[PDB]
Design a binder for this molecule. Structure first.
Ligand SMILES: Nc1ncnc2c1ncn2[C@@H]1O[C@H](COP(=O)(O)OP(=O)(O)O)[C@@H](O)[C@H]1O
Lengths: 79, 405
């Protein structure tokens, strides 16, 4: 399922590749938690919440890396 | 997912390398005389898997080493080999080996022969559905007693842990801290994209200036940098949208949080009745709340009574019934029961046996008993023998088993 990837990000996030992080639609992940097919325990929602935040943090990390490198590339091209 | 095999060495009475014959995926019963080493075998398994053995002072660690004559034992290990055809463990292997090795100043886990941290092992088992907040994948006579003699208040706190109140509060705090440092990343991203953007404006004026009449490399790759900038912008927008949907999620969760706790309580009580009804055909039982300040048990074997005013054997069965209910609310792929039938009538031991028989169709059970009712629900039989002050475990027959009880 889709929430299975979020679970992995909560507990064992190393299984998630950069490609996994990039592809993850956090918006529909959140709708999957917010409106589940079957009501879920407070414990499970807490895990799923951290997983979503963890994938989100990794997107920011990769994007900051790529922005820094793009800025270095451009000013290097100036000289 | 189940326990395929256990290997022990140097651990309490199991001095020598002990390779236990691989378990059945259903019900395995371990029998043997008093002081043969049944409890030590369960200790070996909780030592690898249970959170209460995760932090050990040196004196506690040394207490697990074999003590006896002959050469002095100074290291021990216990290895659990899991069947993972489930892929319930997030490891892409059909078998997964988890070994814990201890010495004078060594306490080291190995996952498929590679050092991992205890934090890893905890996460690994949480991935698979073993929650630190459920103390009941492993049930011992101590746990049954501690349940039968708990204050109505301590029952409340237990069910809240199981419900997830501590977990949610902890996950929520971790998320907020992680959210907060992500915001600093997002700010740096935005400043960087602005610096890139001013470089693109400079390049554009430099390009028109030469057209109306700064290294050439930058002018050559201007369209490239502008195309690349949009790819970063699109990912930056996704972060902005993700921030909104996460804030919405945290709000929804804080608001549903009490209905979520109440949802779990209502199901635990419901299984409690169905479990007591199956165990004691006739009567029934139910939970009740406090001033809430506590959770209480009221039960009648007759076709109501408070907890204390009950037979010490009946207190044992009711608490065990509640443990079964908590388990069904939060089921796991295998269970370890150490002499859970010690303090039970013969009639009720067969009731528990008949239950496990049904449960063993879909989960593995590894149990020890000193009484013969549970032998009827078992699929593989193991005998513990204690000779020269060391324990051994062998596969025995059903007939042999009725002989170590
Ligand atoms: N650290 C140890 N080293 C060697 N033997 C031990 C150690 N701890 C306990 N034992 C022995 O192992 C035997 C008890 O094993 P135990 O598993 O509790 O018996 P039972 O089979 O009734 O559950 C006792 O002889 C006990 O003293």
């Amino acid at each position: 399922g889709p929430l299975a990837k979020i679970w992995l990000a909560a507990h064992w996030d190393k299984k998630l590749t950069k490609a996994h992080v990039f592809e993850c639609n956090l918006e529909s992940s959140v709708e999957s938690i917010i409106s589940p097919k079957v009501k879920m325990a407070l414990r499970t929602s807490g895990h799923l919440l951290l997983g979503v935040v963890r994938i989100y943090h990794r997107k920011a990390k990769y994007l900051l890396a790529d922005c820094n490198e793009a800025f270095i590339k451009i000013k290097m091209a100036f000289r | 997912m189940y326990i395929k095999q256990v290997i022990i060495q140097g651990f309490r009475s199991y001095r020598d390398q002990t390779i236990v014959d691989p378990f059945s995926s259903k019900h395995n019963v371990i029998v043997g005389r008093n002081g043969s080493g049944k409890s030590n075998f369960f200790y070996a398994i909780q030592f690898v898997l249970s959170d209460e053995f995760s932090h050990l002072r040196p004196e506690q660690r040394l207490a697990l080493l074999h003590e006896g004559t002959g050469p002095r034992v100074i290291s021990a290990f216990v290895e659990i080999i899991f069947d993972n055809s489930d892929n319930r463990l997030p490891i892409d292997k059909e078998e997964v080996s988890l070994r814990r090795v201890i010495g004078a100043k060594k306490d080291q886990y190995f996952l498929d022969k590679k050092m991992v941290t205890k934090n890893d092992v905890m996460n690994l088992l949480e991935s698979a559905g073993f929650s630190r907040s459920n103390p009941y994948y492993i049930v011992k006579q101590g746990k049954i007693n501690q349940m039968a003699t708990a204050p109505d208040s301590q029952r409340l706190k237990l069910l809240r842990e199981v419900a997830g109140t501590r977990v949610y509060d902890e996950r929520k705090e971790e998320s907020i801290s992680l959210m907060k440092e992500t915001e600093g990343k997002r700010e740096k991203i935005n400043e960087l994209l602005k610096y890139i953007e001013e470089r693109l404006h400079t390049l554009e004026e430099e390009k028109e200036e030469l057209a109306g009449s700064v290294n050439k490399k930058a002018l050559d790759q201007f369209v490239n940098f502008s195309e690349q900038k949009e790819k970063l912008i699109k990912r930056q927008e996704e972060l902005d949208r993700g921030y909104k949907s996460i804030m919405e999620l945290m709000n929804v969760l804080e608001l549903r949080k009490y209905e979520a706790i109440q949802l779990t309580f209502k199901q635990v009580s419901k299984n409690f009745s169905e479990v007591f009804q199956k165990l004691v055909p006739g009567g029934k039982a139910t939970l009740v709340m406090k001033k809430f300040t506590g959770v209480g048990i009221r039960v009648s074997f007759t076709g109501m009574r408070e907890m204390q005013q009950l037979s010490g054997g009946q207190k044992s069965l009711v608490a065990l019934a509640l443990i079964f209910a908590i388990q069904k609310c939060d089921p796991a792929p295998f269970y370890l029961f150490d002499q859970i039938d010690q303090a039970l009538d013969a009639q009720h031991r067969k009731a528990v046996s008949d239950m496990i028989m049904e449960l063993a169709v879909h989960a593995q059970f590894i149990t020890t008993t000193f009484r013969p009712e549970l032998l009827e629900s078992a699929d593989k039989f193991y005998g513990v023998k204690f000779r020269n002050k060391v324990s051994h475990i062998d596969v025995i027959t059903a007939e042999m088993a009725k002989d170590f009880v």
